[PDB]
Amino acid sequence: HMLSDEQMQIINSLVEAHHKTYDDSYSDFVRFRPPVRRLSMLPHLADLVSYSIQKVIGFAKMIPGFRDLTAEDQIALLKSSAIEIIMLRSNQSFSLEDMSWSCGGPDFKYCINDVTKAGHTLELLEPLVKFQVGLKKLKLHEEEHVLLMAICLLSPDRPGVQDHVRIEALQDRLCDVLQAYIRIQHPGGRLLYAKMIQKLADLRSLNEEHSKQYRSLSFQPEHSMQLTPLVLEVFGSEV
Amino acid sequence: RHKILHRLLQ
Ligand SMILES: C=C1/C(=C\C=C2/CCC[C@]3(C)[C@@H]([C@H](C)CCCC(C)(C)[N+](=O)[O-])CC[C@@H]23)C[C@@H](O)C[C@@H]1O
């Protein structure tokens, strides 16, 4: 039937947070180490991911209630979910006609091959690309896209979470907002909520394979040295 | 550890 002011407020907060941390001009990308097309794209993509991690952190800090988690819990959530949030938010540059992420310039058009030249295999890139395609076809409203990122960040079922109850309740509030939003505002969305929760499951699997391949990278110092300090901290295994 | 993350999280 309708949404409450508290719920509508959450949507507004999330949408603003995302506009504040996602720059459609991609003008900052020239400041990364340039793309080169053994492992020639690793410097450029490591910089891209490092920058994106800062952006996800800025997004998280503006999720209602995230700030009020303990610092361990905030780190716990971010360490396990960063690569997933990056995969979600990257859908906004993904194009179906190119099967690539198009970030303004032709030098910042990442086809699948570019990502192979940064150390990954089709065991990751193939599901990643089909994931982007299925997600792009959902034709998500901005509100739904940002709600999913928030919901994904605030999953209590991450290793290292201590205040399980608090985070779960937060995630409950967001799911309720999403499920309500879709009902009232998304014409023909009767099945959209379940399609989105499935993508959260898909992201867990992409996280797993990514962590596998990142391990192989980081165990070769001649490649890990190309990463950034932020990437090493976030994707690393410290507790 | 998590020196950068703490800082960025303020
Ligand atoms: C990052 C975004 C964008 C594109 C995202 C794509 C395009 C390139 C390939 C990427 C990075 C995948 C890579 C397997 C991650 C490898 C991470 C790295 C440290 C280098 N490593 O080797 O472990 C995940 C996501 C993919 C552009 C824009 O939408 C902003 C948004 O944040």
Tab-separated table of N, CA and C in Angstrom, chain A residues 70-200:
chain	number	residue	atom	x	y	z
A	70	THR	N	30.335	-1.070	16.360
A	70	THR	CA	31.714	-1.024	16.813
A	70	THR	C	32.657	-0.965	15.614
A	71	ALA	N	33.880	-0.510	15.868
A	71	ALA	CA	34.832	-0.407	14.773
A	71	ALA	C	35.225	-1.779	14.246
A	72	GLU	N	35.312	-2.779	15.138
A	72	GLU	CA	35.581	-4.145	14.701
A	72	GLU	C	34.500	-4.610	13.745
A	73	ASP	N	33.234	-4.401	14.129
A	73	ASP	CA	32.111	-4.808	13.288
A	73	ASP	C	32.138	-4.087	11.947
A	74	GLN	N	32.414	-2.772	11.944
A	74	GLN	CA	32.489	-2.067	10.662
A	74	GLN	C	33.586	-2.654	9.788
A	75	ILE	N	34.737	-2.951	10.381
A	75	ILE	CA	35.831	-3.541	9.620
A	75	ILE	C	35.452	-4.943	9.165
A	76	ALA	N	34.922	-5.754	10.082
A	76	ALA	CA	34.415	-7.081	9.722
A	76	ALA	C	33.512	-7.027	8.492
A	77	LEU	N	32.475	-6.184	8.541
A	77	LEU	CA	31.547	-6.094	7.414
A	77	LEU	C	32.258	-5.674	6.145
A	78	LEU	N	33.142	-4.672	6.241
A	78	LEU	CA	33.766	-4.139	5.038
A	78	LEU	C	34.742	-5.144	4.449
A	79	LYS	N	35.527	-5.817	5.290
A	79	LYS	CA	36.496	-6.773	4.757
A	79	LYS	C	35.804	-7.884	3.972
A	80	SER	N	34.713	-8.426	4.506
A	80	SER	CA	34.068	-9.523	3.789
A	80	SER	C	33.225	-9.044	2.614
A	81	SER	N	32.664	-7.840	2.665
A	81	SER	CA	31.705	-7.458	1.632
A	81	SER	C	32.252	-6.521	0.561
A	82	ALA	N	33.467	-5.976	0.715
A	82	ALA	CA	33.932	-4.954	-0.222
A	82	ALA	C	33.913	-5.458	-1.658
A	83	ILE	N	34.479	-6.641	-1.904
A	83	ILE	CA	34.531	-7.089	-3.292
A	83	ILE	C	33.119	-7.291	-3.841
A	84	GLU	N	32.175	-7.706	-2.995
A	84	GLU	CA	30.789	-7.857	-3.455
A	84	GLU	C	30.164	-6.512	-3.813
A	85	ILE	N	30.334	-5.500	-2.948
A	85	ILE	CA	29.799	-4.165	-3.231
A	85	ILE	C	30.402	-3.617	-4.505
A	86	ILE	N	31.697	-3.861	-4.712
A	86	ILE	CA	32.343	-3.372	-5.928
A	86	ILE	C	31.720	-4.031	-7.158
A	87	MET	N	31.471	-5.338	-7.076
A	87	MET	CA	30.816	-6.047	-8.174
A	87	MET	C	29.420	-5.500	-8.437
A	88	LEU	N	28.659	-5.179	-7.372
A	88	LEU	CA	27.327	-4.592	-7.558
A	88	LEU	C	27.412	-3.212	-8.184
A	89	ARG	N	28.195	-2.323	-7.570
A	89	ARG	CA	28.235	-0.938	-8.024
A	89	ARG	C	28.785	-0.836	-9.433
A	90	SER	N	29.677	-1.758	-9.812
A	90	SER	CA	30.218	-1.781	-11.161
A	90	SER	C	29.152	-2.037	-12.209
A	91	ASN	N	27.966	-2.524	-11.816
A	91	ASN	CA	26.917	-2.751	-12.804
A	91	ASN	C	26.512	-1.446	-13.474
A	92	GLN	N	26.677	-0.321	-12.775
A	92	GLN	CA	26.312	0.970	-13.337
A	92	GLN	C	27.183	1.372	-14.533
A	93	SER	N	28.430	0.873	-14.647
A	93	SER	CA	29.214	1.112	-15.866
A	93	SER	C	29.116	-0.032	-16.878
A	94	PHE	N	28.453	-1.132	-16.531
A	94	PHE	CA	28.442	-2.298	-17.397
A	94	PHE	C	27.443	-2.093	-18.517
A	95	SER	N	27.840	-2.461	-19.727
A	95	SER	CA	27.006	-2.285	-20.910
A	95	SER	C	26.716	-3.646	-21.521
A	96	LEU	N	25.444	-3.892	-21.860
A	96	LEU	CA	25.076	-5.179	-22.440
A	96	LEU	C	25.574	-5.305	-23.863
A	97	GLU	N	25.608	-4.194	-24.595
A	97	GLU	CA	25.993	-4.278	-25.998
A	97	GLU	C	27.489	-4.485	-26.165
A	98	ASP	N	28.285	-4.082	-25.178
A	98	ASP	CA	29.727	-4.262	-25.241
A	98	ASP	C	30.217	-5.450	-24.429
A	99	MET	N	29.406	-5.944	-23.488
A	99	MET	CA	29.831	-6.968	-22.535
A	99	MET	C	31.069	-6.506	-21.793
A	100	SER	N	31.084	-5.229	-21.446
A	100	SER	CA	32.241	-4.668	-20.776
A	100	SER	C	31.790	-3.528	-19.881
A	101	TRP	N	32.701	-3.104	-19.024
A	101	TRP	CA	32.479	-1.951	-18.175
A	101	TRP	C	33.054	-0.738	-18.898
A	102	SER	N	32.200	0.223	-19.235
A	102	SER	CA	32.598	1.389	-20.019
A	102	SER	C	32.624	2.618	-19.122
A	103	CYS	N	33.823	3.101	-18.799
A	103	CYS	CA	33.988	4.190	-17.843
A	103	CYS	C	34.436	5.473	-18.535
A	104	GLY	N	33.603	5.975	-19.427
A	104	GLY	CA	33.871	7.272	-20.003
A	104	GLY	C	34.772	7.234	-21.217
A	105	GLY	N	36.023	6.821	-21.031
A	105	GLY	CA	36.973	6.801	-22.119
A	105	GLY	C	37.122	5.429	-22.744
A	106	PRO	N	37.638	5.385	-23.974
A	106	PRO	CA	38.007	4.084	-24.555
A	106	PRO	C	39.164	3.407	-23.832
A	107	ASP	N	40.047	4.157	-23.171
A	107	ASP	CA	41.082	3.459	-22.424
A	107	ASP	C	40.560	2.897	-21.114
A	108	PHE	N	39.472	3.457	-20.590
A	108	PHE	CA	38.787	2.878	-19.440
A	108	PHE	C	37.547	2.083	-19.863
A	109	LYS	N	37.658	1.315	-20.952
A	109	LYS	CA	36.680	0.291	-21.314
A	109	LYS	C	37.297	-1.075	-21.031
A	110	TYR	N	36.860	-1.709	-19.943
A	110	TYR	CA	37.422	-2.983	-19.494
A	110	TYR	C	36.638	-4.143	-20.087
A	111	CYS	N	37.173	-4.745	-21.144
A	111	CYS	CA	36.606	-5.994	-21.611
A	111	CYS	C	37.102	-7.133	-20.720
A	112	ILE	N	36.591	-8.336	-20.978
A	112	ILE	CA	36.957	-9.493	-20.172
A	112	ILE	C	38.456	-9.731	-20.258
A	113	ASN	N	39.034	-9.514	-21.441
A	113	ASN	CA	40.443	-9.826	-21.630
A	113	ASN	C	41.326	-8.948	-20.759
A	114	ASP	N	41.024	-7.645	-20.703
A	114	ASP	CA	41.739	-6.751	-19.798
A	114	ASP	C	41.854	-7.350	-18.404
A	115	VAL	N	40.786	-7.982	-17.907
A	115	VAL	CA	40.832	-8.535	-16.551
A	115	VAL	C	41.643	-9.825	-16.490
A	116	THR	N	41.782	-10.530	-17.604
A	116	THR	CA	42.695	-11.661	-17.613
A	116	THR	C	44.133	-11.197	-17.428
A	117	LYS	N	44.487	-10.063	-18.027
A	117	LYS	CA	45.831	-9.519	-17.908
A	117	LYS	C	46.056	-8.825	-16.577
A	118	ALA	N	45.192	-9.079	-15.599
A	118	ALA	CA	45.425	-8.668	-14.222
A	118	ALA	C	45.431	-9.857	-13.281
A	119	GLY	N	45.499	-11.078	-13.810
A	119	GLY	CA	45.703	-12.261	-12.999
A	119	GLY	C	44.506	-13.173	-12.814
A	120	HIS	N	43.348	-12.872	-13.385
A	120	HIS	CA	42.191	-13.713	-13.125
A	120	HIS	C	41.909	-14.657	-14.287
A	121	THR	N	41.143	-15.710	-13.987
A	121	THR	CA	40.798	-16.753	-14.940
A	121	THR	C	39.300	-16.749	-15.226
A	122	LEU	N	38.936	-17.442	-16.293
A	122	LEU	CA	37.537	-17.485	-16.676
A	122	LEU	C	36.676	-18.162	-15.620
A	123	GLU	N	37.281	-18.930	-14.705
A	123	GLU	CA	36.518	-19.476	-13.590
A	123	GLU	C	35.925	-18.369	-12.736
A	124	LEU	N	36.517	-17.174	-12.754
A	124	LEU	CA	35.922	-16.002	-12.126
A	124	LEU	C	35.204	-15.107	-13.130
A	125	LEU	N	35.840	-14.818	-14.265
A	125	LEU	CA	35.314	-13.787	-15.151
A	125	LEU	C	34.002	-14.214	-15.796
A	126	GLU	N	33.864	-15.493	-16.139
A	126	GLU	CA	32.624	-15.948	-16.764
A	126	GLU	C	31.419	-15.769	-15.846
A	127	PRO	N	31.400	-16.296	-14.614
A	127	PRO	CA	30.252	-16.008	-13.736
A	127	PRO	C	30.094	-14.527	-13.427
A	128	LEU	N	31.205	-13.806	-13.255
A	128	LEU	CA	31.140	-12.363	-13.064
A	128	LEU	C	30.375	-11.689	-14.194
A	129	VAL	N	30.657	-12.070	-15.440
A	129	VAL	CA	30.028	-11.382	-16.556
A	129	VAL	C	28.560	-11.780	-16.674
A	130	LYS	N	28.251	-13.072	-16.515
A	130	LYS	CA	26.845	-13.474	-16.504
A	130	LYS	C	26.107	-12.828	-15.337
A	131	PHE	N	26.782	-12.647	-14.204
A	131	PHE	CA	26.154	-11.936	-13.100
A	131	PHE	C	25.774	-10.515	-13.508
A	132	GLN	N	26.725	-9.765	-14.081
A	132	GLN	CA	26.425	-8.407	-14.530
A	132	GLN	C	25.269	-8.400	-15.515
A	133	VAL	N	25.220	-9.391	-16.394
A	133	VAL	CA	24.176	-9.402	-17.399
A	133	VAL	C	22.812	-9.619	-16.749
A	134	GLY	N	22.701	-10.616	-15.869
A	134	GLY	CA	21.421	-10.867	-15.222
A	134	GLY	C	20.982	-9.697	-14.367
A	135	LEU	N	21.933	-9.054	-13.700
A	135	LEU	CA	21.624	-7.890	-12.879
A	135	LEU	C	21.224	-6.692	-13.736
A	136	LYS	N	21.880	-6.507	-14.884
A	136	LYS	CA	21.508	-5.383	-15.732
A	136	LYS	C	20.105	-5.573	-16.285
A	137	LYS	N	19.715	-6.834	-16.544
A	137	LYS	CA	18.394	-7.135	-17.088
A	137	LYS	C	17.298	-6.895	-16.061
A	138	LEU	N	17.611	-7.009	-14.769
A	138	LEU	CA	16.625	-6.663	-13.752
A	138	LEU	C	16.177	-5.207	-13.855
A	139	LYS	N	16.952	-4.341	-14.529
A	139	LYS	CA	16.536	-2.960	-14.797
A	139	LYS	C	16.130	-2.271	-13.495
A	140	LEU	N	17.000	-2.399	-12.499
A	140	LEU	CA	16.707	-1.947	-11.145
A	140	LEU	C	16.574	-0.438	-11.083
A	141	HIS	N	15.594	0.028	-10.319
A	141	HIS	CA	15.551	1.438	-9.992
A	141	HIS	C	16.786	1.791	-9.182
A	142	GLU	N	17.177	3.064	-9.253
A	142	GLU	CA	18.297	3.553	-8.451
A	142	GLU	C	18.113	3.188	-6.979
A	143	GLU	N	16.907	3.438	-6.453
A	143	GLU	CA	16.541	3.087	-5.082
A	143	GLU	C	16.788	1.612	-4.778
A	144	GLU	N	16.379	0.722	-5.680
A	144	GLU	CA	16.578	-0.703	-5.441
A	144	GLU	C	18.050	-1.068	-5.513
A	145	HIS	N	18.771	-0.474	-6.460
A	145	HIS	CA	20.205	-0.719	-6.587
A	145	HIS	C	20.947	-0.333	-5.315
A	146	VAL	N	20.623	0.829	-4.750
A	146	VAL	CA	21.342	1.267	-3.560
A	146	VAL	C	20.918	0.446	-2.350
A	147	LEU	N	19.636	0.051	-2.292
A	147	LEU	CA	19.161	-0.770	-1.174
A	147	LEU	C	19.874	-2.110	-1.150
A	148	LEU	N	20.067	-2.706	-2.324
A	148	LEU	CA	20.769	-3.980	-2.395
A	148	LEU	C	22.212	-3.843	-1.901
A	149	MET	N	22.906	-2.781	-2.306
A	149	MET	CA	24.263	-2.570	-1.797
A	149	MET	C	24.253	-2.461	-0.278
A	150	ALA	N	23.312	-1.689	0.275
A	150	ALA	CA	23.222	-1.554	1.724
A	150	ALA	C	22.922	-2.897	2.375
A	151	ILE	N	21.949	-3.629	1.830
A	151	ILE	CA	21.593	-4.925	2.401
A	151	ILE	C	22.795	-5.858	2.384
A	152	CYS	N	23.521	-5.889	1.262
A	152	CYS	CA	24.690	-6.753	1.122
A	152	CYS	C	25.770	-6.403	2.143
A	153	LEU	N	26.059	-5.111	2.299
A	153	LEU	CA	27.020	-4.673	3.304
A	153	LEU	C	26.622	-5.123	4.703
A	154	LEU	N	25.345	-5.000	5.042
A	154	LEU	CA	24.887	-5.233	6.407
A	154	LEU	C	24.407	-6.653	6.631
A	155	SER	N	25.052	-7.648	6.033
A	155	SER	CA	24.713	-9.038	6.325
A	155	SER	C	25.411	-9.452	7.612
A	156	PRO	N	24.688	-9.908	8.626
A	156	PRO	CA	25.367	-10.376	9.840
A	156	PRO	C	26.146	-11.672	9.648
A	157	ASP	N	25.953	-12.390	8.544
A	157	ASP	CA	26.560	-13.713	8.394
A	157	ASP	C	27.886	-13.629	7.648
A	158	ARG	N	28.723	-12.785	8.170
A	158	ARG	CA	30.089	-12.635	7.745
A	158	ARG	C	31.009	-13.099	8.858
A	159	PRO	N	32.124	-13.744	8.524
A	159	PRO	CA	33.077	-14.116	9.570
A	159	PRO	C	33.589	-12.861	10.263
A	160	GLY	N	33.658	-12.906	11.584
A	160	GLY	CA	34.205	-11.797	12.326
A	160	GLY	C	33.188	-10.849	12.916
A	161	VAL	N	31.923	-10.957	12.526
A	161	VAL	CA	30.898	-10.103	13.103
A	161	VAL	C	30.705	-10.475	14.565
A	162	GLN	N	30.663	-9.464	15.433
A	162	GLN	CA	30.369	-9.703	16.841
A	162	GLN	C	28.928	-9.367	17.204
A	163	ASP	N	28.432	-8.185	16.844
A	163	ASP	CA	27.066	-7.822	17.228
A	163	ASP	C	26.095	-8.344	16.170
A	164	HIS	N	25.967	-9.666	16.172
A	164	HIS	CA	25.112	-10.336	15.206
A	164	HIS	C	23.685	-9.800	15.255
A	165	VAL	N	23.142	-9.626	16.458
A	165	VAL	CA	21.748	-9.217	16.575
A	165	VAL	C	21.543	-7.831	15.981
A	166	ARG	N	22.449	-6.897	16.274
A	166	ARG	CA	22.256	-5.516	15.836
A	166	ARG	C	22.278	-5.417	14.322
A	167	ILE	N	23.257	-6.065	13.698
A	167	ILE	CA	23.409	-5.987	12.250
A	167	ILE	C	22.215	-6.641	11.564
A	168	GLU	N	21.796	-7.803	12.065
A	168	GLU	CA	20.635	-8.493	11.514
A	168	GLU	C	19.404	-7.599	11.523
A	169	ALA	N	19.154	-6.914	12.642
A	169	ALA	CA	17.999	-6.021	12.707
A	169	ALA	C	18.106	-4.915	11.666
A	170	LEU	N	19.288	-4.301	11.538
A	170	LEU	CA	19.507	-3.318	10.483
A	170	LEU	C	19.162	-3.890	9.118
A	171	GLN	N	19.729	-5.052	8.789
A	171	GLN	CA	19.451	-5.660	7.497
A	171	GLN	C	17.974	-5.972	7.332
A	172	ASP	N	17.291	-6.349	8.424
A	172	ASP	CA	15.843	-6.548	8.382
A	172	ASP	C	15.134	-5.277	7.945
A	173	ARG	N	15.515	-4.137	8.521
A	173	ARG	CA	14.855	-2.884	8.166
A	173	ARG	C	15.010	-2.582	6.682
A	174	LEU	N	16.203	-2.811	6.134
A	174	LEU	CA	16.439	-2.500	4.726
A	174	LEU	C	15.652	-3.432	3.809
A	175	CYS	N	15.631	-4.726	4.120
A	175	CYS	CA	14.847	-5.656	3.316
A	175	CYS	C	13.373	-5.284	3.316
A	176	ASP	N	12.842	-4.903	4.477
A	176	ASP	CA	11.455	-4.461	4.550
A	176	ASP	C	11.222	-3.253	3.654
A	177	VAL	N	12.146	-2.286	3.687
A	177	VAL	CA	12.027	-1.120	2.820
A	177	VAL	C	12.038	-1.553	1.365
A	178	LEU	N	13.009	-2.387	0.993
A	178	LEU	CA	13.109	-2.840	-0.390
A	178	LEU	C	11.838	-3.546	-0.827
A	179	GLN	N	11.390	-4.523	-0.043
A	179	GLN	CA	10.234	-5.315	-0.440
A	179	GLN	C	8.990	-4.434	-0.560
A	180	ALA	N	8.879	-3.432	0.312
A	180	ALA	CA	7.777	-2.486	0.225
A	180	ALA	C	7.932	-1.585	-0.988
A	181	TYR	N	9.138	-1.030	-1.183
A	181	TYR	CA	9.373	-0.152	-2.324
A	181	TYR	C	8.961	-0.831	-3.620
A	182	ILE	N	9.439	-2.056	-3.827
A	182	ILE	CA	9.122	-2.779	-5.051
A	182	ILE	C	7.610	-2.935	-5.205
A	183	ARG	N	6.905	-3.202	-4.103
A	183	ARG	CA	5.461	-3.445	-4.165
A	183	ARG	C	4.712	-2.209	-4.651
A	184	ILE	N	5.038	-1.052	-4.092
A	184	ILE	CA	4.270	0.148	-4.389
A	184	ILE	C	4.743	0.788	-5.685
A	185	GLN	N	6.068	0.890	-5.855
A	185	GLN	CA	6.684	1.780	-6.829
A	185	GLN	C	7.199	1.093	-8.079
A	186	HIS	N	7.337	-0.228	-8.085
A	186	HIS	CA	7.927	-0.873	-9.255
A	186	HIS	C	6.856	-1.649	-10.008
A	187	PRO	N	6.203	-1.054	-11.007
A	187	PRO	CA	5.116	-1.758	-11.703
A	187	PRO	C	5.598	-3.077	-12.299
A	188	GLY	N	4.901	-4.157	-11.958
A	188	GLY	CA	5.318	-5.489	-12.363
A	188	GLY	C	6.534	-6.028	-11.634
A	189	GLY	N	6.620	-5.819	-10.322
A	189	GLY	CA	7.808	-6.239	-9.601
A	189	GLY	C	7.530	-7.393	-8.665
A	190	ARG	N	6.414	-8.073	-8.920
A	190	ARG	CA	5.925	-9.113	-8.020
A	190	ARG	C	7.016	-10.110	-7.668
A	191	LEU	N	7.917	-10.384	-8.612
A	191	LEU	CA	9.003	-11.338	-8.431
A	191	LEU	C	10.371	-10.672	-8.301
A	192	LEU	N	10.426	-9.353	-8.154
A	192	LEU	CA	11.732	-8.702	-8.194
A	192	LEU	C	12.520	-8.959	-6.919
A	193	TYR	N	11.859	-8.902	-5.759
A	193	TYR	CA	12.575	-9.068	-4.498
A	193	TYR	C	13.358	-10.369	-4.486
A	194	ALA	N	12.700	-11.474	-4.841
A	194	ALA	CA	13.368	-12.771	-4.847
A	194	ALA	C	14.513	-12.822	-5.861
A	195	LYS	N	14.377	-12.140	-7.001
A	195	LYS	CA	15.464	-12.127	-7.972
A	195	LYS	C	16.689	-11.452	-7.396
A	196	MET	N	16.479	-10.430	-6.557
A	196	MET	CA	17.575	-9.674	-5.969
A	196	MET	C	18.272	-10.467	-4.873
A	197	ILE	N	17.491	-11.151	-4.027
A	197	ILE	CA	18.068	-11.988	-2.974
A	197	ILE	C	18.900	-13.106	-3.581
A	198	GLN	N	18.489	-13.613	-4.742
A	198	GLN	CA	19.298	-14.608	-5.430
A	198	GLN	C	20.646	-14.025	-5.834
A	199	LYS	N	20.661	-12.777	-6.312
A	199	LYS	CA	21.933	-12.157	-6.663
A	199	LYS	C	22.829	-12.004	-5.449
A	200	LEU	N	22.255	-11.789	-4.267
A	200	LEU	CA	23.105	-11.785	-3.083
A	200	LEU	C	23.790	-13.138	-2.917
